[PDB]
């Protein structure tokens, strides 16, 4: 019974490594030796956060590129104004440990997890000016790692018990669920026209995730390690991951193969978060080795470097208009970074 | 533009509100202790949760000293990565019982697995081993269960500096002795952590076990403002 | 694609010998500490003995401490397990497993139920 399975799984695994193979026409590098490089970009602090004790952990920008939420280990959620470095809102959170937040892109709700297996959404529609707990959501079984919002009634949730999620706020049970991993699913990444979405685990794979459907259509086997970071090229073809074998990684969905390695042999620790600008031409990635990387999207060379944080960057984010790039570590600062020329 | 100023002295205004409950909540968290109560499996645990959702937490508080000790839950047994979560508190709790699959050998291998990460070289690790007389009801029924494991038990000796319970049988106290010296080896072995590991033999039912985690949390305290002085 | 895969066992004797294979595809072979796990049947996971990224850290499980033989081959791309006299007590499943992080001396939780970059393992049986 299992003998008939295991060679019938190791069939198609040649078969789709045979595809693969057929289907690589050539080779990224090769196509863009004649591409002009990007050259030294040298990114200064404009403004830095200093409201959290406890380290930073996780930080989403708004749509308006105006307020970012940034969450700490103490138990707070702090929501910033980027711009004057004055918060505009605190709230105390009910689980001292949150592990993902992420702003809703209406701007009215506010989504917060951690190891309680809870996702607690708040809401800002309040008459009284006082934060509340619009609505918790307690249906995984391992730790809540990763939340997106959709909309203003559904979300997309990651947690560290092999599953994702499709939630609707307004019922406040799963509309669907996911369930294709077999390590803990370390974060996620919505596509911009929000009909599929990626989801990047500790199982060395990252799975495409449709959301109508429920099942996962593509699968990418690239990595050695754990893969923690995932995040869309702004088009939606293409994703990059980051890992904790010191290489990220630039796949491509319908290529269905990885177009590109990011390494170098000096660097050894691991990556926490990456994301990409508004065009795409530059990689941002954060690693555990006390700073940040800006790498060349298309050449594969270090466009610049970040070391501005005493401890490891947990999380970099990057708006939506492109102006500036905020990265949280674990030091409890914010720094916000932009180009000067 | 009068409309831009009043808008900047009401954020003004709402600042300083939230710098002051910062600042009224800075000394809270400061002056609290955090514990990871944190065992290998059936050793226990739950006596020290009733004496001393995915995580449990108790407030108990010594001499106007307070400490929350978090106990993991339903959680998934890949410890690997929400671990590294625990990097900040003041001490990991890690308890385990002395006495089908061996036990003792994947305790051994989970501590040294905590003690030679990276990230938990600052956080100190309080050893706790339980269940000490069913260790010695092992012992004197006469079935090997130490030195089929452990070949290294045949050719040991009890500690001249260990100071015996009276009223035990000496082959209990030297392998009480003999599973202390092979944590304290697997502590020993690494030598570069900034960080320092606290034997305790403990019964099923005990009093004195919030005091000594009280005298090695205030000794681990005092260990970091001497490093930091530079005395240490 | 990190693959791991299993050869050698079978049916031997008490007291007899057998040796182990496990080829590694997919990574970085020198980097990773690695070890091996064995599953008796009626009973869980647990740890047996390990070797380091260039082999010179080598422990073992007190059980079979004095008895087994662990190696690694770095340009065969290769780890090995020589078992010599044998007890009727170590019929088990036994498994090639990796350390998941690079570069680093902690393993977490390579006996652990559901982990994923262990290999499928091999049948021993070491009946009379």
């Known amino acids: 019974e299992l003998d008939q399975l295991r060679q019938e799984a190791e069939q198609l695994k040649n078969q789709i490594r045979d595809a693969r193979k057929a289907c690589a026409d050539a080779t990224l590098s090769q196509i863009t030796n004649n591409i002009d490089p990007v050259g030294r970009i040298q990114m200064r602090t404009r403004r830095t956060l200093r409201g959290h004790l406890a380290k930073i952990y996780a930080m989403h920008w708004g749509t308006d590129s105006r307020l970012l939420v940034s969450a700490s280990q103490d138990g707070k959620l702090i929501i910033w104004d980027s711009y004057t470095t004055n918060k505009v809102h605190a709230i105390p959170l009910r689980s001292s440990w949150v592990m993902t937040c992420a702003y809703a892109p209406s701007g009215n709700y506010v989504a917060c997890g951690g190891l309680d297996n809870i996702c607690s959404i708040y809401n800002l529609k309040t008459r009284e000016g006082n934060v509340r707990v619009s609505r918790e959501l307690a249906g995984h079984t391992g730790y809540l790692s990763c939340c997106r919002f959709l909309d203003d009634n559904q979300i997309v949730t990651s947690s560290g018990d092999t599953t994702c999620a499709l939630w609707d706020i307004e019922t406040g049970q799963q509309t669907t669920t996911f369930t294709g991993h077999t390590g803990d699913v370390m974060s996620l990444s919505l596509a911009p026209d929000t009909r599929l979405f990626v989801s990047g685990a500790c199982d060395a794979s990252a799975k495409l995730w449709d959301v109508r459907e429920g099942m996962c259509r593509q699968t990418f086997t690239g990595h050695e390690s754990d893969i923690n970071a995932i995040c869309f090229f702004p088009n939606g073809n293409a994703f990059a991951t980051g890992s904790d074998d010191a290489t990220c990684r630039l796949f491509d969905l319908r290529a269905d193969q990885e177009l590109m390695t990011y390494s170098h042999d000096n660097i050894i620790c691991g990556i926490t978060s990456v994301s990409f600008s508004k065009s795409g031409r530059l990689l941002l990635a954060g690693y555990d080795d006390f700073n940040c990387n800006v790498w060349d999207a298309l050449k594969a060379d270090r466009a610049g470097v970040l070391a501005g944080h005493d401890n490891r960057v947990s999380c970099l984010g990057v708006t939506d208009d492109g102006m500036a790039v905020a990265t949280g570590s674990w030091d409890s600062f914010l720094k916000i970074w932009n180009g000067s020329s | 533009t009068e409309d831009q100023r009043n808008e900047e002295k009401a954020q003004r205004e709402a600042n300083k509100k939230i710098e002051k409950q910062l600042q009224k909540d800075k000394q809270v968290y400061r002056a609290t202790h955090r514990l990871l109560l944190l065992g290998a499996g059936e050793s226990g645990k739950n006596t020290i949760v009733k004496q001393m959702s995915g995580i449990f937490e108790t407030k108990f508080q010594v001499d106007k000293v307070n400490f929350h000790m978090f106990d993991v839950g339903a959680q998934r047994d890949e410890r690997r990565k929400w671990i590294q979560c625990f990097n900040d508190v003041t001490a990991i709790i890690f308890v385990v019982a002395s006495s089908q699959t061996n036990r003792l050998q994947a305790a051994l291998k989970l501590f040294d697995s905590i003690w030679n990460n990276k990230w938990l070289r600052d956080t100190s690790v309080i050893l706790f081993l339980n269940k000490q007389d069913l260790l010695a009801e092992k012992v004197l029924a006469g079935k090997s269960k130490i030195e089929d494991y452990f070949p290294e038990f045949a050719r040991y000796t009890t500690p001249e500096d260990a100071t015996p319970e009276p009223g035990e049988d000496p082959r209990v106290t030297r392998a009480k002795y003999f599973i202390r010296d092979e944590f304290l080896r697997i502590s020993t072995a690494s030598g570069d952590g900034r960080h320092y590991c606290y034997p305790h033999f403990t019964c099923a039912v005990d009093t004195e076990n919030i005091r000594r985690v009280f005298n090695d949390c205030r000794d681990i305290i005092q260990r970091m403002h001497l490093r930091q002085y530079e005395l240490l | 694609q990190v693959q791991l895969q299993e050869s050698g066992g079978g049916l031997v004797q008490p007291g007899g010998s057998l040796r182990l294979s496990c080829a590694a595809s997919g990574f970085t072979f020198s980097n990773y500490k690695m070890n091996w796990v064995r599953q008796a049947p009626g009973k869980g996971l647990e740890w047996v003995s390990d070797?380091?990224?260039?082999?010179?850290?080598?422990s073992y499980t007190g059980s079979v401490k004095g008895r087994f033989t662990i190696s690694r081959d770095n340009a065969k791309n290769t780890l090995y397990l020589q078992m010599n006299s044998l007890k009727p007590e170590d019929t088990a499943v036994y498994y090639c497993?990796?350390?998941?992080?690079?570069?680093?001396?902690?393993?977490?939780?390579?006996?652990?139920?559901?982990?994923?970059?262990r290999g499928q393992g091999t049948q021993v049986t070491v009946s009379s």
């Open positions: 070797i380091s990224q260039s082999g010179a850290s080598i």
């Open positions: 497993a990796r350390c998941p992080a690079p570069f680093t001396r902690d393993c977490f939780d390579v006996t652990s139920t559901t982990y994923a970059y």
